[PDB]
Scaffold this active site. Structure first.
Site, PDB file in Angstrom:
ATOM      1  N   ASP A  25      42.853  50.537  38.592  1.00  0.00           N
ATOM      2  CA  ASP A  25      43.452  50.010  39.821  1.00  0.00           C
ATOM      3  C   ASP A  25      44.946  49.731  39.934  1.00  0.00           C
ATOM      4  O   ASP A  25      45.490  49.765  41.039  1.00  0.00           O
ATOM      5  CB  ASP A  25      42.709  48.740  40.250  1.00  0.00           C
ATOM      6  CG  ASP A  25      41.262  48.991  40.589  1.00  0.00           C
ATOM      7  OD1 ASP A  25      40.973  49.994  41.269  1.00  0.00           O
ATOM      8  OD2 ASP A  25      40.415  48.170  40.190  1.00  0.00           O
ATOM      9  N   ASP A  59      45.662  37.087  18.733  1.00  0.00           N
ATOM     10  CA  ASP A  59      44.845  35.898  18.915  1.00  0.00           C
ATOM     11  C   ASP A  59      43.983  36.035  20.151  1.00  0.00           C
ATOM     12  O   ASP A  59      42.816  35.652  20.154  1.00  0.00           O
ATOM     13  CB  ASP A  59      45.725  34.654  19.044  1.00  0.00           C
ATOM     14  CG  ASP A  59      46.506  34.365  17.781  1.00  0.00           C
ATOM     15  OD1 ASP A  59      45.874  34.242  16.713  1.00  0.00           O
ATOM     16  OD2 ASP A  59      47.746  34.263  17.849  1.00  0.00           O
ATOM     17  N   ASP A  76      28.186  42.617  35.642  1.00  0.00           N
ATOM     18  CA  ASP A  76      27.180  42.927  36.649  1.00  0.00           C
ATOM     19  C   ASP A  76      27.533  43.886  37.771  1.00  0.00           C
ATOM     20  O   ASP A  76      26.875  43.892  38.818  1.00  0.00           O
ATOM     21  CB  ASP A  76      26.785  41.602  37.287  1.00  0.00           C
ATOM     22  CG  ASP A  76      27.988  40.849  37.884  1.00  0.00           C
ATOM     23  OD1 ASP A  76      29.164  41.342  37.889  1.00  0.00           O
ATOM     24  OD2 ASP A  76      27.732  39.728  38.367  1.00  0.00           O
ATOM     25  N   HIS A  84      35.509  36.674  32.050  1.00  0.00           N
ATOM     26  CA  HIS A  84      35.115  35.573  31.168  1.00  0.00           C
ATOM     27  C   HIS A  84      36.020  35.565  29.946  1.00  0.00           C
ATOM     28  O   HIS A  84      36.586  36.605  29.575  1.00  0.00           O
ATOM     29  CB  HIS A  84      33.620  35.590  30.767  1.00  0.00           C
ATOM     30  CG  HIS A  84      33.163  36.827  30.049  1.00  0.00           C
ATOM     31  ND1 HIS A  84      32.215  37.692  30.545  1.00  0.00           N
ATOM     32  CD2 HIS A  84      33.506  37.327  28.834  1.00  0.00           C
ATOM     33  CE1 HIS A  84      32.016  38.669  29.651  1.00  0.00           C
ATOM     34  NE2 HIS A  84      32.775  38.505  28.583  1.00  0.00           N
ATOM     35  N   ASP A 100      35.738  45.628  35.025  1.00  0.00           N
ATOM     36  CA  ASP A 100      36.391  46.758  35.669  1.00  0.00           C
ATOM     37  C   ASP A 100      35.626  47.373  36.835  1.00  0.00           C
ATOM     38  O   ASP A 100      35.943  48.477  37.275  1.00  0.00           O
ATOM     39  CB  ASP A 100      36.843  47.813  34.668  1.00  0.00           C
ATOM     40  CG  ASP A 100      38.293  48.218  34.888  1.00  0.00           C
ATOM     41  OD1 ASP A 100      38.965  48.607  33.912  1.00  0.00           O
ATOM     42  OD2 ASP A 100      38.775  48.128  36.046  1.00  0.00           O
ATOM     43  N   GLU A 102      35.312  45.501  39.440  1.00  0.00           N
ATOM     44  CA  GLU A 102      35.968  44.772  40.517  1.00  0.00           C
ATOM     45  C   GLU A 102      37.235  45.534  40.853  1.00  0.00           C
ATOM     46  O   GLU A 102      37.685  46.369  40.071  1.00  0.00           O
ATOM     47  CB  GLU A 102      36.337  43.347  40.069  1.00  0.00           C
ATOM     48  CG  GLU A 102      35.210  42.562  39.381  1.00  0.00           C
ATOM     49  CD  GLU A 102      33.952  42.432  40.223  1.00  0.00           C
ATOM     50  OE1 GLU A 102      34.070  42.531  41.464  1.00  0.00           O
ATOM     51  OE2 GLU A 102      32.838  42.220  39.650  1.00  0.00           O
ATOM     52  N   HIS A 119      43.446  31.719  35.120  1.00  0.00           N
ATOM     53  CA  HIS A 119      42.236  30.915  34.971  1.00  0.00           C
ATOM     54  C   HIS A 119      41.561  31.247  33.640  1.00  0.00           C
ATOM     55  O   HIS A 119      41.180  30.346  32.881  1.00  0.00           O
ATOM     56  CB  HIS A 119      41.271  31.179  36.142  1.00  0.00           C
ATOM     57  CG  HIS A 119      39.912  30.566  35.971  1.00  0.00           C
ATOM     58  ND1 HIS A 119      39.532  29.364  36.525  1.00  0.00           N
ATOM     59  CD2 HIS A 119      38.825  31.006  35.285  1.00  0.00           C
ATOM     60  CE1 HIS A 119      38.262  29.112  36.165  1.00  0.00           C
ATOM     61  NE2 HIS A 119      37.769  30.078  35.405  1.00  0.00           N
ATOM     62  N   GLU A 120      41.398  32.536  33.350  1.00  0.00           N
ATOM     63  CA  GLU A 120      40.758  32.942  32.098  1.00  0.00           C
ATOM     64  C   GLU A 120      41.545  32.482  30.870  1.00  0.00           C
ATOM     65  O   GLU A 120      40.954  32.017  29.892  1.00  0.00           O
ATOM     66  CB  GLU A 120      40.515  34.454  32.053  1.00  0.00           C
ATOM     67  CG  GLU A 120      39.480  34.945  33.067  1.00  0.00           C
ATOM     68  CD  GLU A 120      38.170  34.159  33.028  1.00  0.00           C
ATOM     69  OE1 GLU A 120      37.680  33.812  31.926  1.00  0.00           O
ATOM     70  OE2 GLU A 120      37.622  33.867  34.114  1.00  0.00           O
ATOM     71  N   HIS A 123      40.843  29.135  29.736  1.00  0.00           N
ATOM     72  CA  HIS A 123      39.672  29.114  28.867  1.00  0.00           C
ATOM     73  C   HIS A 123      40.053  29.497  27.434  1.00  0.00           C
ATOM     74  O   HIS A 123      39.615  28.849  26.478  1.00  0.00           O
ATOM     75  CB  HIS A 123      38.582  30.072  29.363  1.00  0.00           C
ATOM     76  CG  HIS A 123      37.907  29.640  30.633  1.00  0.00           C
ATOM     77  ND1 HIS A 123      37.473  28.360  30.887  1.00  0.00           N
ATOM     78  CD2 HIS A 123      37.535  30.374  31.715  1.00  0.00           C
ATOM     79  CE1 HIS A 123      36.860  28.354  32.083  1.00  0.00           C
ATOM     80  NE2 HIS A 123      36.867  29.555  32.632  1.00  0.00           N
ATOM     81  N   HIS A 129      35.856  24.306  32.999  1.00  0.00           N
ATOM     82  CA  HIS A 129      36.022  24.164  34.436  1.00  0.00           C
ATOM     83  C   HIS A 129      36.258  22.728  34.862  1.00  0.00           C
ATOM     84  O   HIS A 129      35.815  21.795  34.205  1.00  0.00           O
ATOM     85  CB  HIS A 129      34.820  24.770  35.174  1.00  0.00           C
ATOM     86  CG  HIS A 129      34.678  26.246  34.973  1.00  0.00           C
ATOM     87  ND1 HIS A 129      33.532  26.860  34.516  1.00  0.00           N
ATOM     88  CD2 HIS A 129      35.590  27.241  35.120  1.00  0.00           C
ATOM     89  CE1 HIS A 129      33.778  28.173  34.401  1.00  0.00           C
ATOM     90  NE2 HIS A 129      35.019  28.460  34.753  1.00  0.00           N
TER      91      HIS A 129
HETATM   92  O1  LIG Z   1      34.824  30.933  35.719  1.00  0.00           O
HETATM   93  C1  LIG Z   1      34.257  31.969  35.340  1.00  0.00           C
HETATM   94  N1  LIG Z   1      34.879  32.606  34.338  1.00  0.00           N
HETATM   95  O2  LIG Z   1      35.979  31.867  33.825  1.00  0.00           O
HETATM   96  C2  LIG Z   1      32.922  32.434  35.959  1.00  0.00           C
HETATM   97  C3  LIG Z   1      33.139  32.655  37.484  1.00  0.00           C
HETATM   98  S1  LIG Z   1      34.007  34.097  38.043  1.00  0.00           S
HETATM   99  O3  LIG Z   1      33.852  35.250  37.187  1.00  0.00           O
HETATM  100  O4  LIG Z   1      33.610  34.304  39.400  1.00  0.00           O
HETATM  101  C4  LIG Z   1      35.707  33.605  38.222  1.00  0.00           C
HETATM  102  C5  LIG Z   1      36.636  33.974  37.256  1.00  0.00           C
HETATM  103  C6  LIG Z   1      37.952  33.652  37.456  1.00  0.00           C
HETATM  104  C7  LIG Z   1      38.341  32.929  38.574  1.00  0.00           C
HETATM  105  O5  LIG Z   1      39.680  32.735  38.649  1.00  0.00           O
HETATM  106  C8  LIG Z   1      40.203  31.772  39.491  1.00  0.00           C
HETATM  107  C9  LIG Z   1      39.760  30.435  39.583  1.00  0.00           C
HETATM  108  C10 LIG Z   1      40.403  29.568  40.432  1.00  0.00           C
HETATM  109  C11 LIG Z   1      41.470  30.048  41.150  1.00  0.00           C
HETATM  110 CL1  LIG Z   1      42.345  28.992  42.179  1.00  0.00          CL
HETATM  111  C12 LIG Z   1      41.922  31.363  41.074  1.00  0.00           C
HETATM  112  C13 LIG Z   1      41.260  32.234  40.236  1.00  0.00           C
HETATM  113  C14 LIG Z   1      37.401  32.497  39.514  1.00  0.00           C
HETATM  114  C15 LIG Z   1      36.081  32.847  39.328  1.00  0.00           C
HETATM  115  C16 LIG Z   1      32.336  33.703  35.253  1.00  0.00           C
HETATM  116  C17 LIG Z   1      31.723  33.419  33.883  1.00  0.00           C
HETATM  117  O6  LIG Z   1      30.779  32.342  34.007  1.00  0.00           O
HETATM  118  C18 LIG Z   1      31.375  31.113  34.407  1.00  0.00           C
HETATM  119  C19 LIG Z   1      31.894  31.273  35.841  1.00  0.00           C
HETATM  120 CA   LIG Z   2      31.167  41.853  38.663  1.00  0.00          CA
HETATM  121 ZN   LIG Z   3      32.764  39.990  27.469  1.00  0.00          ZN
HETATM  122 ZN   LIG Z   4      36.167  30.125  34.406  1.00  0.00          ZN
END
Ligand SMILES: O=C(NO)C1(CS(=O)(=O)c2ccc(Oc3ccc(Cl)cc3)cc2)CCOCC1
Ligand SMILES: [Ca+2]
Ligand SMILES: [Zn+2]
Ligand SMILES: [Zn+2]
Length: 164
Positions: A25, A59, A76, A84, A100, A102, A119-120, A123, A129
């Protein structure tokens, strides 16, 4: 002697990351810029330092894959799971995987890579969260940027403020 840390966190301030592969993309530079900015979000408020590795063991190993890709958390297809990341630790600890299936972008279309990556990486650094709907660590995607205070408080609880 040494007992294990109280929280999952890196024991060093200098971390490395490697972009293993790329999404169809965006251009390599767009992806590299998105990730660089995503890491800066966190280094700006802590004493953490991020260096990109072009190969080898880093790392935080970053990759784009679909369905079953090498862990117990298969993707999925379009929508659903977007990405994740694994908390600090050996092997896959710190690694961040992006689905990929998405549509990743550097704009408001599809899913903004910078935001999801930010966000990732939270983690990868030890943050789970938040319940605060306005936090970057809130588990639901929203397009926008200044790191919310809840996230600043969380990351600093683990690593300190660094300069300032
Ligand atoms: O949070 C996630 N991954 O970190 C999960 C949700 S997810 O894949 O839809 C997902 C991943 C990243 C996200 O990023 C953002 C979160 C908040 C904001 Cl402002 C912007 C972006 C938001 C949602 C997937 C793995 O299981 C736990 C939930
Ligand atoms: Ca997906
Ligand atoms: Zn994985
Ligand atoms: Zn998350």
């Amino acid at each position: 002697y040494n007992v294990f840390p109280r929280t999952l966190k890196w024991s060093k301030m200098n971390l490395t990351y490697r972009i293993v592969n790329y999404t169809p993309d965006m251009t390599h530079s767009e992806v590299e810029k998105a990730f660089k900015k995503a890491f800066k979000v966190w280094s700006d408020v802590t004493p953490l330092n991020f260096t990109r590795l072009h190969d080898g063991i880093a790392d935080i190993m970053i990759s784009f894959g679909i369905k079953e890709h090498g862990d117990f958390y298969p993707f999925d297809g379009p929508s659903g799971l977007l990405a994740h990341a694994f908390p600090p630790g050996p092997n896959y600890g710190g690694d961040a995987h992006f689905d990929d299936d998405e549509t990743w972008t550097s704009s408001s279309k599809g899913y903004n890579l910078f935001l999801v990556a930010a966000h990732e990486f939270g983690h990868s650094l030890g943050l789970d969260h938040s319940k605060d709907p306005g936090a970057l660590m809130f588990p639901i995607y929203t397009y926008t940027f200044m790191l919310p205070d809840d996230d600043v408080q969380g990351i600093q609880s683990l690593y300190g403020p660094g300069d300032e």
